[PDB]
Symmetry: D2
């Protein structure tokens, strides 16, 4: 993680859908992972309390540490979530608060999707934990994160482990990127309400008529760079004005169009260390269907994993590997 | 059309590719069209002269008028080109200049793809034409257009029907959008040279340390709206910093990543009349392989058509119909 | 009041200066006012309670209601301060909290300048009051306000009457505009660290050399509009980069040059109700000299009033009227 | 000379005024200068060819070379003019065109002001010279310039010595800054017609209500940097929306308010060499009164020089020195 943008939408088909880009410097080993009922999830890597998950879920994540680490995903009850980067804001304890279990920041999604249904259930879950400053071994250190969840009803919350403790925002707009805090970007929105689909009227200066070059002038002032605040604005504004999806397939299509204003080609963002920071995959999930969808930097063809198609009582993780090959369809040889 | 964005790139394997978005109000009947050798292209709708075309080509177009109308394409000799909108600038005669033939703006691509090989041939063919104000029955007027072309060698030109005549730009940057003229955007680039992939350094204000929120701060000042001028900067600047493509396939993918910065969702742009202006399709073509590739608003899976696999002496247009259903690969039962 | 911008600075010779624009709809009856010691200042306009002020002070203000309303000023002990618009963010109570007395928002500056020396005195002072939702016979309701103070030593604080309580900000950057909160703008600074005095480097695209139009390109990204957020960034950044003032006169000059980036001409900003919102005056204060300096929309020559020049035990307010005529010096017979 | 912004305006009083900031990297010796009729101004600094000037004029300039060099000014018949930097575009000849004299770029304002009445006179005068690459100025290469003139009637033109020859633009908006060329900025204006005094309408994202911070949001998309193109846009847009000046004083006041959005404080712009580029003075001039007005980086009080006050058949240049000291009026001891 060194970036992601995320949003949810609601179709006129009464379906809730959630999507996120994931931006990074090289693709570690990641796949679509289905975690079955009762598989059990660690709280901490350095202690063996395993929490038993009532619910099966499907998500993108990693199988490299003790328990599956999910980056986003949706569960068998329609709860959807993601963990996103929160640099220079995320604050974690050394010690669990009186009467909470310690939890590794990288296990939050996995634990939440494994046992929650509603955003309230999540709020209640989280305040029984303390996010702890424990390293991990796929990345080396404790990554600064925040979290977004959307339940089948389409309510979104954002959970943010700030300096002063866990900040929680109820019924958000359904947009989240990276730092700063949710209330900062929400406030930022008010600066940009003049950003619309509609052209400004022509004007005159003295004798001179002034008309726009073509279309899109309504959007003047929207920023084009790939910072988190600019990313937030674009995803929010394009989410407000892009037409309602009529069904789940359109929902995925629209989700990836909105996200495309924030998709990063290899080379256009370099980190301090000269590492190239780019959009590795783009994912979408639907609460009602429990389908999970993803396309990759190298393959814009969308793939799909249906959670309910599997044996939710399986002994073992079920996984699907990435196909990083552009899946071009040949219309003649 | 209402808008579009285009660019060309060169792979490290000596291929040239060109790609464009097509932005429009609603989608008329468009498909991919192979025009065979010797098929014939009309110059004008109101006159019946049909110019025999030497070359076969493939691209995106309409078959609603007398001769196939091509929006972009590549021909059997590796000439690539496109017509894009040029609102407020395009200017057409009522009548041909002495010793030129009249040509409808919407036939320029089909004529040129059918009869030219190199950037210079394009220039030469054009001085034998005069663009006329002739309408057509898909649109009802002559749409204001300008044109771009890229040959096998990777040279790009822009051709602009201006108030004072055809302006030609030789050896361009390989980017073209819509109005204003090409010199204006080229100059406009200079205002944004500080937009780079690299982050700026922390500063202090008094006691206060100031650091960026994440990455991407290098690009501060780039505009994010979908006007022609902002599209031009985005495609030009992201053409500059995007990693060189190593082969044809990666060239296609790179092209659509770059064009993603300027892909318009349905609803985000509306015309003075409240019609939504959105990216209907996105296409790419390679001069060396003569493959055409495209994906749709409703389908992000790339399709490909190979000009040279067909019979270039066919009697009839060979055409491939859009598939408007999101082509999702089921990894288990869905 | 519908807006203003403020900053403080420090000179080479150890002097602290504070400056503000005032932006408004109408030019109201406003003057420089010297309040002597022991004049007595109401706390609440609908009540008869008066705190007897220990300190004399000078700033711009109104004599419309029972006690002088100061919009900014410096006192004889070197405390500087100002009230500014805090729209959509200022929250007041109907009744005082246990142990405090109510105070009207437009009395804050008067009370504080009348009774405080350091920013810490200001913080202490304030915990014995609760800002009340009390209106006035000048604007017809309690204006949404926030406050800034800078003491002799150059330390600045912001105080913000938020929904959740009074928010103090200690050791600030010494810039304040309007909404939103100081924490938001402080955070917003980080998005703009790439705005510098330094040109970006030339680049190429293909064969094309690209170089700035002139000077100034290191500022790409700074916004030019008159929103509070945009004005904060212009005042903060131009505060960072504009040279240190060597003495008091240069401080005033520099402060007004910086403020000039946020001066509003008549007509460029209109309210919802179609009222013109423009900068009526600009003032600076100096902690060490206790001079007050000001200029007006129609008068660009700066005036000064010296607090320490007057009898500080006067019975009566001392006041100086605005000279609203452009004060042009004729160098020969004009 | 290193940058400048200019505009002209027309009062309801039926008066025409013109104004300009001047940017530069230190204080040069510059005064306001009244050139009497029949004084004599060279064309070329390296030939002693004198042109007798029919008219008298006042403006800001330098006496450091043989004939006075004026940066701007107004003559006794109501012609106002200025020269402004035009870097990377200004192109001049080595040799005059058959039938023309060589003129130094730096002498254009002085020659014109001393011999022309109308903007048509300027267009005509100019076809009898070729601008030349004369170094010195013992400042030494001829600086890259373009020119604006506005006559008593309120018409403005721009003259640009381009690669393809001299370009004239007639009936301009009466805004000019620096590079690029005039039609490039005129076209640029079109991208910003959405910049208005009027606030945008509040909107909703879901349940969340969004309203501006304060006032001024109509301006979103106006850049606040000091590049020539940003300056061009701030002058033109604030020229368009600033209230009409109702008399000559208001005109001067209004011009300095508009120019104040482009006034450069010392330290905020540095050159590729790390010199500081700042606004040394701002001036205005009225075609009908023939008054010259000016204020300084260090002196916000406006001074005025009246052309018609002097003896216009004077033998000698009449001169006023800058007063570089903040002219603060003391209202008490």
């Amino acid at each position: 993680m060194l970036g992601s943008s995320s949003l949810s939408i609601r179709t006129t088909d009464d379906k809730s859908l959630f999507a996120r880009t994931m931006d990074f410097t090289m693709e570690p080993d990641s796949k679509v992972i289905i975690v079955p009922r009762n598989y059990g999830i660690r709280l901490l890597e350095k202690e063996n309390v395993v929490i038993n998950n009532s619910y099966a879920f499907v998500g993108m994540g990693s199988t490299d540490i003790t328990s599956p680490v999910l980056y986003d995903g949706v569960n068998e009850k329609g709860l959807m979530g993601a963990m996103l980067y929160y640099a220079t804001f995320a604050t974690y304890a050394d010690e669990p608060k009186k009467g909470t279990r310690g939890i590794n920041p990288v296990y939050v999604i996995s634990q939440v999707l494994g046992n929650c249904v509603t955003v309230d259930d999540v709020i209640e879950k989280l305040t029984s934990y303390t996010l702890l400053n424990e390293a991990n071994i796929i990345l080396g250190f404790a990554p600064p994160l925040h979290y977004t969840f959307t339940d089948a009803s389409g309510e979104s919350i954002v959970i943010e482990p700030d300096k002063t403790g866990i900040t929680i925002h109820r019924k958000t707009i359904g947009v989240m990127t990276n730092s700063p805090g949710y209330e900062w970007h929400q406030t930022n929105l008010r600066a940009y309400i003049g950003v619309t689909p509609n052209p400004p009227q022509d004007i005159m200066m003295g004798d001179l008529d002034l008309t726009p070059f073509g279309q899109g002038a309504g959007g003047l002032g929207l920023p084009g760079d790939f910072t988190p605040s600019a990313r937030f604005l674009r995803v929010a504004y394009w989410k407000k004005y892009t037409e309602k999806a009529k069904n789940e397939t359109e929902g995925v299509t629209n989700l990836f169009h909105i996200l495309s204003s924030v998709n990063i080609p290899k080379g256009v963002v370099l980190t301090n260390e000269g590492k190239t920071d780019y959009t590795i995959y783009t994912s979408a999930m639907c609460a009602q269907s429990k389908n999970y969808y993803f396309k990759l930097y190298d393959n814009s063809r969308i793939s799909a994993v249906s959670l309910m198609a599997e044996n939710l009582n399986s002994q073992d993780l079920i996984t699907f590997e990435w196909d990083r090959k552009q899946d071009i369809k040949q219309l003649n040889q």
